[PDB]
Amino acid sequence: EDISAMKNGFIVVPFKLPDHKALPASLHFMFAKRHQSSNSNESDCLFLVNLPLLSNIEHMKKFVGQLCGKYDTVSHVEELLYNDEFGLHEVDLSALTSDLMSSTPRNTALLKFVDAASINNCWNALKKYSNLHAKHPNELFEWTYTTPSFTTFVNFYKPLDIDYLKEDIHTHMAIFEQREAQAQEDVQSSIVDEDGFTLVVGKNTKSLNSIRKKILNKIDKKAKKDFYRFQVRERKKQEI
Amino acid sequence: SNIFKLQIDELLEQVKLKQKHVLKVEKFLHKLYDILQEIPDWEEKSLAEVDSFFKNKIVSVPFVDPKPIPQNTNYKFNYKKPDISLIGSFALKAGIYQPNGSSIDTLLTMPKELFEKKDFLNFRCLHKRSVYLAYLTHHLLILLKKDKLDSFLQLEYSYFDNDPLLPILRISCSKDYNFYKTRFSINLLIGFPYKVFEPKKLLPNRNCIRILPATPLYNFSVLSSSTHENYLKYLYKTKKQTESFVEATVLGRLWLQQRGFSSNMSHSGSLGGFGTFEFTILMAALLNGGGINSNKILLHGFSSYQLFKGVIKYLATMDLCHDGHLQFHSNPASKYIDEGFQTPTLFDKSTKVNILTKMTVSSYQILKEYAGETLRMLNNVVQDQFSNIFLTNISRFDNLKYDLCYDVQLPLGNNLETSLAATFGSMERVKFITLENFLAHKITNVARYALGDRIKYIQIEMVGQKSDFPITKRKVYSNTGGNHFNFDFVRVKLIVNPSECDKLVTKGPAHSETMSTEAAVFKNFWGIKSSLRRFKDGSITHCCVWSTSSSEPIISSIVNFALQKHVSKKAQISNETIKKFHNFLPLPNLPSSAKTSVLNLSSFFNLKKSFDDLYKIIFQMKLPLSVKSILPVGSAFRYTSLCQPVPFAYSDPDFFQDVILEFETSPKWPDEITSLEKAKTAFLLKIQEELSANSSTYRSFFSRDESIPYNLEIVTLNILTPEGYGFKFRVLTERDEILYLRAIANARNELKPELEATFLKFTAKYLASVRHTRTLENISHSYQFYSPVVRLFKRWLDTHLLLGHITDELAELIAIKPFVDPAPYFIPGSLENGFLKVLKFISQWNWKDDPLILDLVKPESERLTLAQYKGIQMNFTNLRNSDPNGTHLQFFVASKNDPSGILYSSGIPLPIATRLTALAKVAVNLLQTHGLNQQTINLLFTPGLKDYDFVVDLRTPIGLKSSCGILSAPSNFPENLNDLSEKMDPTYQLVKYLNLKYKNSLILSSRKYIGVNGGEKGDKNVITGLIKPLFKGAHKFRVNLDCNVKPVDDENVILNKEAIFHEIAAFGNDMVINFET
Amino acid sequence: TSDDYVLRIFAIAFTRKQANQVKRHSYAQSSHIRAIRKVISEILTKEVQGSTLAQLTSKLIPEVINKEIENATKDIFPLQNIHVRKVKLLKQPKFDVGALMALHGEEKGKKVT
Ligand SMILES: Nc1ncnc2c1ncn2[C@@H]1O[C@H](COP(=O)(O)OP(=O)(O)OP(=O)(O)O)[C@@H](O)[C@H]1O
């Protein structure tokens, strides 16, 4: 209870758990740290560890909302990056098999903010909220477990809207055909280097990348033992 | 052959008796012979005098029934010094070490002057022998007291080879001359001199008990008793000639013991009659001929393996009971005669003794089958069969060795009912000396005739039969018997015939103007149950019709009626063990479900007919690509679905049977994976809309599939047939396979194994699945009982919460092992027999070191050859080389379809794999301690549920048992297909998601089928978890923990069990009710 | 087949002239013929081995085998009238009444009195 920050620098952020009849003051504990990275999409972000089950951005909207009201700080979290509770998106099978249409830890995610003023506001608010559990455990915020996203996952057996599916297949097929068309023209367009080297492209080749991949993936028989004067002399040597 | 030869040597030395004990026993009975010589003689005595002589003595004469009465016993009795000798295996020095203990057979020859030429009539010789055994026992006793040896010797009477007519004295040692460590017991056999009685008078056809009917049993006992040293001398010669006689003999002895064969009589009921002596004599007979042309079948230069093979082959092929018999001369080349005596016969012209008189017809048929079965294993070259032939005991359990067992409790059991004792009469007494022999035949004949062709082999066993009695008593005492019948109850054991065990009508002789003898016996045998019926072909025959039931087989009804009508109207026949297993199969909610037999697959066929209607519709529609083929791969298409299909029963997990739809090869398929899947989905859209327009009576909808990891674009079309069946369609494209192989190649080296796992699941669903369903469907027809047992086996796994991690196809491959490879047992022919064999295999399966490889073929091509067979084991050694402990992979199941051997057995956590073996060991151990009964079966199918760390109870809002199609109900599909989920059970999906979230810390389990194992309403299911040992204790905080933990120190955290319960609670919503930690 | 049903298949194909062809004939070189024959034998062997006869007969009726042969051998040389000319049954295994009944999808008598 007295623990507010971990020595490695991860601040403990307890949450009050909901009340359920089957399960008659228990808490869940988060571990957070400021994130630094030159990458723009990863800039202005906050490490979060030990996320609750099915924690979306709409969840983060609520938690920051209570902190903003309680500590009168202006903080907006734009999106929650790298939120993979179940690891479905660990690998991108689309990107790996080809480049067209896809040019590209665990139990953690990156919480990006709208601006630096928002994240540093939240970090200061988070530090105070960490101190609360030691003094006043009652006023710890309450995590829901219920969202419009949550119920959709709950209803596993839902037939897909056929109208929605048809449109999705239509647009995806349309986009793929354009990219496939552009790639095939590029390879069979008489590519010439600046120093006048013309690339050799076989018929039916569709994408220049595959030529690169094909490259990456990939005298003794004509020699006579008895033809020269020295060869026959060598044979004469081994004969005796 | 060299491997076999070396393996034989290891067995002989292992069972070789320790020579020190030979000296220890030889030290004793050498002196015992001196004690016998001290025994003095008698004068002539009548029964009155000897009766007074033994009136006060502790010893009592073991007179054989019928005991001599003063009127017919006027012949006197006398004793004289015997000619002591040693016979049996010990004389030939061919014995082996037996933990239970062996016996030394010492023969005492009654001097010839004690007998008259007609002493073989009316038990006259037998009663003289019995008293001769008395003063031996009496005055042996006091000399043992004189020599102080009585402290550690226990003396008791016993029957030689369970022969009621040949009582003998047994000397045993309890805890210098103390030989208890030798585990030996000296048996004193009082034999007659050679050729006292004209052997021609003692032939099986002749009679020797006056009352005429023949007396084969009585004639054998006296004649064999007078021929002991002769056979020893005969066997001694052969041992000298051929060097491998003893090695062959010990192999035969070891083979016989594993099959539960002994030299004891079989007329009493116990399986036996063929022992080491009979095997040895047969080998000697074959060494001097044996063929129809009197040519030698065995040569003296043969090795142990060759001598054993010839004897086994001789029994397997040549018939010695019905058509043909073998004659040899102990004192002359052995020749096979074509004529048969209708009983097992190995005649000896020199001695006029039939060595197989103790061998019953019913037992002989089983012996021939076992010899034939081994001759196949012996000829096998692909697989080593040494362990199965010699190092596996099949006689431990009757249930495993026999398909069905019925115990018949006879009435008035301190003597049998007057009606029953009356049936014995004098006529059967002379034929059959004891009532037990008579009753054993009576049960066998009626049971054999009543069941007829429905069974292959029948055994009648008298449970609780004793063969040794105290010296103070004359005859063995049974607690139920009261000296009247030495058995508690009779048990009928059968080997059913699956093809025709469940025939509804028992055919009989055809009708004629004059009733034939066969027609007469058929009508008399069945009485009112008989009838004359006509069939569609127009034939008129006598047949009796029975009724099928889902709880018991037809054979139960037949034996119950057949025995009661003929044996006793008061008999109680009860086989409840089979009944419990039958009830454990879910009962489908179809018309006349209760009356349907468990071998009926009509429910599956009706599903297939609905598929064919949809099959025609799909082919005839016009699509951009022609439909190459539609392949059904669902569970119901191979007769393995746990609950039989039921129309409109969509709460069943297996309701939607998967189907593989393949189009003609094209070059227009997308080269990118997600485009390929969306291109596949585009084809399903046309199949949906064209089906919707042309055939409005069919309903359809789309659902997403995520079984293949990282391929999130799979969309499957579900078709709701009007008949009330569901089918799930998925498109297979030739480009799809190579796109995955492209994936493994292009992926980074550390990631390469993970993609291989994705490919492994893909081939399990799309490629290997078609091969699996094809072969299993074809094979299952030959193995009728495979479908019920695999369904019951899957039911057993679900109760213990194992199906969640064991893929259904792995369970089938384990469940088929007793069928394709029944050795050393027979193919299962009963639901009880099949299921227990599966458990027996799992209990003794050392999956760490032994691979499981199966030849999915019909009973004796596609059989695994030596090259393929060697290839697969090489794979196992390579895998175990990298995974010696088996943490990554536990079960190695391979076959022609799966040469890799890891396709169906990957991803199972180690605790689950050990739990599956742990439960199997417990299940077999429970059966050994407590015999198969109602309580034991319930304990098998009840889950302990206490080992798991925390247990969560769930209740569905509505009971799904009715909607699952299980008879303790919907009749049409809902108007809005969204209503389907309202009557579904998601907990299986719930556990799957939670496993993947808490993969590093928890192993959650649940019951896949709630309608079968969810109580009466089928609404209760339980989620059981297991915390790994690592995260159970406290750990230092690291970003790589990947676990939900709570701090205790600045750098110390512990698993937050309570918080996890919340996530399970909200993730279950209303369904969760209770927690138990 | 997978049912141990030994059978012999005969396939027949003919060359065809392209849409813009002007030559009277459409003969193929023996190298093309040997190449086409190898492809056909591979397809016939593959389908029979990976199928039961009941499955094999199910393939014969829609003539999906011929369309598969067309696409595979097409790049080698255009073809027409591709058909499975004949099918023979050389050997049969042990007769199985249970399997036969399943393919076709028992009965009490009537008392004669
Ligand atoms: N079926 C038989 N026919 C004729 N004689 C027999 C028969 N069975 C046993 N005997 C005689 O009884 C003697 C002892 O019989 P037993 O069956 O104990 O022999 P064994 O093979 O030495 O026994 P074990 O297996 O105990 O070592 C045999 O040597 C033979 O003389």
Ligand SMILES: [Mg+2]
């Ligand atoms: Mg013996």
